Design an enzyme around this catalytic site. Structure first.
Site, PDB file in Angstrom:
ATOM      1  N   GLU A 123     -10.654  48.408  79.351  1.00  0.00           N
ATOM      2  CA  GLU A 123     -10.016  47.121  79.117  1.00  0.00           C
ATOM      3  C   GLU A 123      -8.690  47.240  79.885  1.00  0.00           C
ATOM      4  O   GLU A 123      -7.854  48.118  79.593  1.00  0.00           O
ATOM      5  CB  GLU A 123      -9.725  46.917  77.633  1.00  0.00           C
ATOM      6  CG  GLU A 123      -8.939  45.632  77.333  1.00  0.00           C
ATOM      7  CD  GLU A 123      -8.527  45.505  75.874  1.00  0.00           C
ATOM      8  OE1 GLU A 123      -8.759  46.442  75.073  1.00  0.00           O
ATOM      9  OE2 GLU A 123      -7.958  44.452  75.533  1.00  0.00           O
ATOM     10  N   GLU A 206      -2.235  37.117  73.066  1.00  0.00           N
ATOM     11  CA  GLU A 206      -2.574  37.914  71.891  1.00  0.00           C
ATOM     12  C   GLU A 206      -1.513  37.510  70.897  1.00  0.00           C
ATOM     13  O   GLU A 206      -0.322  37.616  71.190  1.00  0.00           O
ATOM     14  CB  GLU A 206      -2.473  39.407  72.150  1.00  0.00           C
ATOM     15  CG  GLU A 206      -3.504  39.946  73.130  1.00  0.00           C
ATOM     16  CD  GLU A 206      -3.568  41.456  73.088  1.00  0.00           C
ATOM     17  OE1 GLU A 206      -2.733  42.134  73.727  1.00  0.00           O
ATOM     18  OE2 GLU A 206      -4.463  41.971  72.387  1.00  0.00           O
TER      19      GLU A 206
END
Ligand SMILES: OC[C@H]1O[C@@H](O[C@H]2[C@H](O)[C@@H](O)[C@H](O[C@H]3[C@H](O)[C@@H](O)[C@H](O)O[C@@H]3CO)O[C@@H]2CO)[C@H](O)[C@@H](O)[C@@H]1O
Length: 226
Positions: A123, A206
Site C-alpha cells: 500500500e 483518511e
C-alpha cells in the site's frame, strides 16, 4: 449531484472511468458525501467521526480495482515492470478542524485477483495535506526528492508493506504528478517487487475525527504500458 451516506455506498463517475466510495470502513459514525457524477468531485457534507488513533473512514475516488470492484477499461491490474508512465492530478480543499489527511492510497499485490484484498502486497500512500497532528503508520526511514517535491518516507512491515510519502510541506493540488517515480523509489527500497501488480490508484481523505468541508476535485489518473 447525488448524496451518499451509506457505509459502503458508491457511484461510478466520469463515464465509468472512476468510482467514488463513501467507505466508512473503520467506524459506525455517520458520514455523507455529495458527488458530481460527471467529474467525480465530492465534498464531505457530514462526518460525525471521533475514532481516536484509528482511521474511521476513507471517502475516496479511484481508478482500477478496489477489493475486486473495478472501474471501466482501466487497464489494471498491470505488473509494475510492465508500467512505463503513471500520472495523476487532483485538487483538494482543506479545512482547519478535525484530524484527517488528504492522501493517495495505491494498492499492489502479487496476484491479479483483488477480491480479498492485498495481503502480501503493498500500500503506497502519498500524503498531500492534513490537520490535527495525524501521522503515517510505521516509522520515517528517509526523506527523498521525487516528482518535483520532497517527501518523508514512512514504512511499516504489516501483512502488506505500508509505504507513505509525506510531503515536507502541505499542498492543495498536483497536476500530472509522476506516480511512477514513487513506485520506482519503493521498488528500489525493496518495498514493492517489480513482478507485483498495480491494482488501483485512489485518493481521498483518511478521517480520524470530523472532516466535513473537505473537497476532492479534478481527479485524473492515466497509466501507460511498456
Ligand atoms: O469495501 C471493500 C472492503 O473494504 C475493506 O476496507 C478497507 C478499505 O476499503 C480501504 O480503503 C482501507 O485502506 C486503508 C488501509 O487499511 C490503511 O493501512 C491505510 O493507512 O489507509 C487506507 C485508507 O484508510 O483498508 C480497509 C481495510 O483493509 C473492508 O475491510 C472489507 O470488509 C471490504 O470488503
Amino acid at each position: 449531484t447525488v448524496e451518499l451516506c451509506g457505509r459502503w455506498d458508491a457511484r461510478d463517475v466520469a463515464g465509468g472511468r472512476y468510482r467514488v466510495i463513501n467507505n466508512v470502513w473503520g467506524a459506525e459514525t455517520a458520514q455523507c458525501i455529495e458527488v458530481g457524477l460527471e467529474t467525480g468531485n465530492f465534498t464531505i457534507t457530514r462526518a460525525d467521526h471521533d475514532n481516536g488513533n484509528n482511521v474511521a473512514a476513507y471517502p475516496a475516488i479511484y481508478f482500477g480495482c478496489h477489493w475486486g470492484a473495478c472501474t471501466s477499461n482501466s487497464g489494471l491490474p498491470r505488473r509494475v515492470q510492465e508500467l512505463s508512465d503513471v500520472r495523476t492530478s487532483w485538487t483538494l480543499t482543506p479545512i482547519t478542524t478535525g484530524r484527517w489527511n488528504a492522501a493517495y492510497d495505491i494498492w499492489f499485490s502479487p496476484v491479479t485477483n483483488s477480491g480479498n484484498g492485498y495481503s502480501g502486497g503493498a500500500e503506497l500512500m502519498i500524503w498531500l495535506n492534513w490537520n490535527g497532528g495525524v501521522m503515517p503508520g510505521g516509522s520515517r526511514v528517509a526523506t527523498v526528492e521525487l516528482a518535483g517535491a520532497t517527501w518523508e518516507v514512512w514504512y511499516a512491515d504489516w501483512d502488506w508493506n505500508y509505504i507513505a510519502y509525506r510531503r515536507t510541506t502541505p499542498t492543495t493540488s498536483v497536476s500530472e504528478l509522476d506516480l511512477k517515480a514513487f513506485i520506482d523509489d519503493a521498488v528500489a527500497r525493496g518495498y514493492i517487487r517489480p513482478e507485483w501488480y498495480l491494482h488501483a490508484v485512489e485518493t481521498g481523505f483518511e478521517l480520524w475525527e470530523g472532516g466535513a468541508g473537505l473537497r476532492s476535485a479534478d481527479f485524473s489518473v492515466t497509466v501507460q504500458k511498456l
